[PDB]
Curated annotation (Swiss-Prot), chains A, B, C, D:
It is found in: Secreted. The chain holds residues 38 to 158 of 183 of the full protein. It comes from Streptomyces avidinii. A motif (Cell attachment site) lies at residues 47-49. The lineage of its organism: Bacteria, Bacillati, Actinomycetota, Actinomycetes, Kitasatosporales. It comes from the Bacteria. This is Streptavidin.
């Protein structure tokens, strides 16, 4: 699935996700959010199962973005956990955790949860 | 915090997390779970905010492990979203998402959620 | 929104959710899952904000189902946290947590996470 | 476990959770948060598995609080999904989802995730 994951992806919020899969299971690329305190590109890095079960199952994968680059620092980070589903309508369906730096007093409200779907089009 | 994150960490389940922080905000290392379908070490990769707010806030960070190495393939992946808290009792408090490859029929039950705390001792 | 929430709802998995809103903010009804270890109806109970912000915001709400009734006991429970969005395309968008009874050894893998969308049609 | 769940519980944040279990599997009571936009008591309602597996497994359960009462309205709701563990150190370990009413534009950032542990003491 190294081939199928590599490329440009778009989510329901209009975010852009550009990624390269390594044969060992590495994922490198950049992310650009369409929402929130973000601006231009951010590095992403991750892992994917480089030998998925041959039974029509998705390919598990994950990545992280620290929301710091040359333009802004949102003092936060998001990780995406999900699976790549290939074929004629190729999808990466994910749930994500966004954590932001907080004082220990405010740690209870430090983590947002949500879900994104990525397609090759739009 | 590049200095404080780098090193060996242990969580409440007895898992071992060895990590190196880059100055640009990179996190590389290996993970060894004490539970589940895992055996020996797995690559991890991630991002961390390399310039945290000076106000006593934690440092946001995240990483991913694809549960595939030379011994086993659990066809799954876990991402950790959380923050590093330094000082005399240094902690990485996280929530994690574990996704496993599934058929689209079973995608509703593909994702486990939980939380880990890492300390330098134990 | 007491009026708009009350009624029969359907989610993307084909599940059926029948609910009555009280004026005090109570939610009572029954749930029938289309997937998993479930069969016929299960009681649900919950709360909703009975005075939402007049600014075009959704109405926060939640409910719980213990997966035990006269036919089966899945020894689990699911809670839905989300918001009701009214108008011509009325939606309840939720994320859900499904916890199952486990031994303390297996507690790390006790909780599934996912998301459901409910509409009045389909 | 109807007996063991009923009573007053306290979490790591210093919140107070007073609950009555019905024999059918109902949970009614009040919640008082020690943090956030809350003040005095809020109704809670929920479900619990009223016949847990005899194998040393926890008892699955869940509840909801809409953050509206006579004093304040936070336009939000939280659901707790978890299990009751009895014995000499009785615990309700939960993960929780807090959703707040938002505009559809801001729905991506509407949901906080976290975890609470409740004990009978402190
Ligand atoms: Ir979806
Ligand atoms: Ir904790
Ligand atoms: Ir959705
Ligand atoms: Ir805990």
């Amino acid at each position: 699935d190294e081939a199928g994951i590599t490329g440009t992806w778009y989510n329901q919020l209009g975010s852009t996700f550009i990624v390269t899969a390594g044969a060992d299971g590495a994922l490198t690329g950049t992310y650009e959010s369409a929402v929130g305190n973000a601006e231009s590109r951010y590095v992403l890095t991750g892992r994917y199962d480089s030998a998925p079960a041959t039974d029509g199952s998705g390919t598990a994968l994950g990545w992280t973005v620290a929301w710091k680059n040359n333009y802004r620092n949102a003092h936060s980070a998001t990780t995406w956990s999900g699976q790549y589903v290939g074929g004629a309508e190729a999808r990466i369906n994910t749930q994500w955790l966004l954590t932001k730096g907080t004082t220990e007093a405010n740690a209870w409200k430090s983590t947002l949860v949500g879900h994104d779907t990525f397609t090759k089009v739009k």
